[PDB]
Design an enzyme around this catalytic site. Structure first.
Site, PDB file in Angstrom:
ATOM      1  N   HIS A  63       2.093 -10.826   8.249  1.00  0.00           N
ATOM      2  CA  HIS A  63       2.487 -12.190   8.616  1.00  0.00           C
ATOM      3  C   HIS A  63       2.627 -13.097   7.413  1.00  0.00           C
ATOM      4  CE1 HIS A  63       2.729 -11.387  12.865  1.00  0.00           C
ATOM      5  NE2 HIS A  63       1.537 -10.830  12.809  1.00  0.00           N
ATOM      6  N   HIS A  67       8.142 -11.772   6.030  1.00  0.00           N
ATOM      7  CA  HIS A  67       8.320 -11.631   7.475  1.00  0.00           C
ATOM      8  C   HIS A  67       9.139 -12.804   7.995  1.00  0.00           C
ATOM      9  CE1 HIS A  67       7.582 -11.117  11.704  1.00  0.00           C
ATOM     10  NE2 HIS A  67       6.925 -12.253  11.774  1.00  0.00           N
ATOM     11  N   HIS A 101       7.904 -19.996  11.560  1.00  0.00           N
ATOM     12  CA  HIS A 101       7.263 -19.705  12.834  1.00  0.00           C
ATOM     13  C   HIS A 101       5.840 -19.070  12.707  1.00  0.00           C
ATOM     14  CE1 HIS A 101       7.908 -15.723  11.752  1.00  0.00           C
ATOM     15  NE2 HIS A 101       8.034 -15.196  12.940  1.00  0.00           N
ATOM     16  N   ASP A 102       5.488 -18.633  11.481  1.00  0.00           N
ATOM     17  CA  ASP A 102       4.144 -18.076  11.199  1.00  0.00           C
ATOM     18  C   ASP A 102       3.382 -18.832  10.072  1.00  0.00           C
ATOM     19  OD1 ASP A 102       3.551 -15.973  13.074  1.00  0.00           O
ATOM     20  OD2 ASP A 102       4.933 -14.625  12.078  1.00  0.00           O
TER      21      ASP A 102
HETATM   22 MG   LIG Z   1       3.414 -15.208  15.041  1.00  0.00          MG
HETATM   23 ZN   LIG Z   2       6.294 -13.595  13.345  1.00  0.00          ZN
END
Ligand SMILES: [Mg+2]
Ligand SMILES: [Zn+2]
Ligand SMILES: COc1cc2ncnc(N3CCC[C@@H](c4ccccc4)C3)c2cc1OCCc1ccccn1
Length: 305
Positions: A63, A67, A101-102
């Site tokens: 993550h 990614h 998004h992470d």
């Molecule tokens: Mg996530």
């Molecule tokens: Zn993700």
């Protein structure tokens, strides 16, 4: 400035963004340029946003910043091959959502945060990391010189942030099972309506899942190596679960590593294949994701024999 091999291969759903970290920002700039126009973002504002996003990703095995860009690239590919379906604003929002998004992920699941009693679970009782990811996105936008949406109207600003919020929340895979069920019902009764905003949100949600899971749509060598990074976090979490006094699920238990292939079969059958099957029904130009998913399912079945 993008080299020729990347100008070509970046249009492939199965593109891999490569090991050169310093290239990823220009890769994302190019994608957003090509999808949304060079007149759309102030270039040095966007650059500064991008580097501040990179900086608030962590050095975790999966993550991570790589990614994030990879997920954005999948979204770029979906958007490129479905001309005319999504608004300017939707394409801007979705690409930024994917990049963000992470944000500030630790390599641990919401479930582990809840068992640990992490402060984030008190603050956000559901979709814990995903709410934090969106919170981080806003905080970065509010930093001096980081508002990449500064030329949009107030209304369009609130609009694009809401697009981003819903897209980041949708990457909580716990939400995918119900979302996809609803969409498959809609498809098969001919009731799906892209002009309906709730249906449209669902479709975007599914797209966000599709991009988030895209490791399983690359060519096998990429898919297989990406799985090493996925399991490194899973196993680190299961160790942590063992340390709280809780027996981890098998998938997070390094002592059950010989069952990884069976586990992959489980995942492809219950999650990946249905996900891209439904996405191809709604957006037929996304079919290469499904085909590559099926080829990887075959490879995992090969490993077992
Ligand atoms: Mg996530
Ligand atoms: Zn993700
Ligand atoms: C590409 O490999 C995976 C990526 C994943 N990404 C996000 N969440 C996952 N899991 C979250 C919890 C449940 C899990 C799931 C759901 C339905 C069926 C199977 C798994 C999905 C993932 C599981 C994966 O395979 C790891 C698969 C696995 C399962 C069991 C033992 C070893 N490996």
């Amino acid at each position: 400035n993008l080299p020729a091999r990347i100008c070509r291969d970046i249009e492939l759903f199965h593109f891999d963004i490569g090991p050169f970290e310093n290239m990823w920002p220009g890769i994302f700039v190019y994608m957003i340029h090509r999808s949304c126009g060079t007149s759309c973002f102030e270039l040095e504002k966007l650059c500064r946003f991008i580097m501040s996003v990179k900086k608030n990703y962590r050095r975790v095995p999966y993550h991570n910043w790589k990614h994030a860009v990879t997920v954005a690239h999948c979204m770029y590919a979906i958007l490129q091959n479905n001309n005319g379906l999504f608004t300017d604003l939707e394409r801007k929002g979705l690409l930024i959502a994917c990049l963000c998004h992470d944000l500030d992920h630790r390599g641990f699941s919401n479930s582990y945060l809840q068992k640990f009693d992490h402060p984030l679970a008190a603050l956000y009782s559901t979709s814990t990391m995903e709410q934090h990811h969106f919170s981080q996105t806003v905080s970065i936008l509010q930093l001096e010189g980081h508002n990449i949406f500064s030329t949009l109207s107030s209304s369009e600003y609130e609009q694009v942030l809401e697009i981003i919020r819903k897209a980041i929340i949708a990457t909580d895979l716990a939400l995918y099972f119900g979302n996809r069920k609803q969409l498959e019902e809609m498809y098969q009764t001919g009731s799906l309506n892209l002009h309906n905003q709730s249906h449209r949100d669902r479709v975007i949600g599914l797209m966000m899942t599709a991009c988030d899971l895209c490791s399983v749509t690359k060519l096998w060598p990429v898919t297989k190596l990406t799985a090493n990074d996925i399991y490194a976090e899973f196993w680190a979490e299961g160790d942590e679960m063992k340390k709280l006094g809780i027996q981890p699920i098998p998938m997070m238990d390094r002592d059950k590593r010989d069952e990884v292939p069976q586990g992959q079969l489980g995942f492809y059958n219950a999650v990946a294949i249905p996900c891209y099957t439904t996405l191809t029904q709604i957006l037929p130009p996304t079919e290469p994701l499904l085909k590559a998913c099926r080829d990887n399912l075959n490879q995992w079945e090969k490993v077992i024999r």
